[PDB]
Every structure is written in C-alpha cells, then in structure tokens.
Amino acid sequence: ACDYTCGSNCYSSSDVSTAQAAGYKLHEDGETVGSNSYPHKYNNYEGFDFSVSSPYYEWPILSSGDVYSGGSPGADRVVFNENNQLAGVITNTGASGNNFVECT
Numbered sequence: 001a002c003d004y005t006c007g008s009n010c011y012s013s014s015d016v017s018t019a020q021a022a023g024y025k026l027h028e029d030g031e032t033v034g035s036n037s038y039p040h041k042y043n044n045y046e047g048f049d050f051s052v053s054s055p056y057y058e059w060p061i062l063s064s065g066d067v068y069s070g071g072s073p074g075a076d077r078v079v080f081n082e083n084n085q086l087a088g089v090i091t092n093t094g095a096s097g098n099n100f101v102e103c104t
C-alpha cells in the first residue's frame with residue numbers, strides 16, 4: 001500500500017522523509033537547484049488545510065526514489081515549513097495548468 005498516491009506515483013513515508021531532509025538542508029543553507037529555484041516559497045493559492053504553520057516551502061519528490069538535484073522536477077512535491085514539519089504531499093497531476101491537488 002501507498003502512504004501517498006500522486007496520480008499514478010506511489011510514495012511511502014520513508015520517501016517523504018528523505019525528500020524533506022534534502023529540501024530543508026538546502027533551505028537552511030540558502031541554496032537552490034534547478035530552473036524553478038527549488039526549494040522556494042509555497043504561497044498556498046489553493047488554500048489547503050495544513051495542520052502546521054506558515055511559511056511553507058515546496059520541494060520535488062521523485063518517482064525514481066532519487067533525491068532532486070536539478071533538471072526535470074516532475075509533478076510531485078513535498079511541502080514543509082520553517083520548523084522542518086511536513087505540511088503535505090501535493091501534485092500538479094490531475095489539476096489544471098500549474099494548480100495543485102493533494103496526494104491521497
């Protein structure tokens with residue numbers, strides 16, 4: 001069973017924790033990777049009901065099981081805050097344009 005289902009992509013809790021640790025470390029260091037400057041500020045335009053506090057940051061979680069290092073991000077993202085608390089696992093898959101839906 002999947003802990004998070006992002007369209008067709010399957011993630012476990014360990015996949016989420018590994019991607020999140022990698023994202024937070026780059027956030028702490030003031031460093032970014034890729035063309036869309038990951039991790040950046042997630043403004044919550046969709047208005048998701050995240051249990052943890054604002055400011056939020058989006059980072060790519062990959063279907064390959066590899067940590068994001070540049071190039072193509074895919075459609076899947078881990079959302080974390082300033083305290084390294086996970087807000088949610090979101091995806092562009094099944095949402096119009098660059099909008100996001102929550103991973104089930």
Ligand SMILES: Nc1nc2c(ncn2[C@@H]2O[C@H](CO)[C@@H](O)[C@H]2OP(=O)(O)O)c(=O)[nH]1
Nearest residue numbers: 036040041042043044045046058098099100
């Ligand atoms: N849909 C969405 N995009 C966001 C949000 N915060 C920042 N973005 C950025 O706003 C722009 C339009 O959606 C994109 O560059 C996108 O970055 P990403 O492509 O990296 O998600 C948000 O809360 N929702």
Ligand SMILES: [Ca+2]
Nearest residue numbers: 011012015065
């Ligand atoms: Ca996995």
Ligand SMILES: [Ca+2]
Nearest residue numbers: 036092097098
């Ligand atoms: Ca995008």
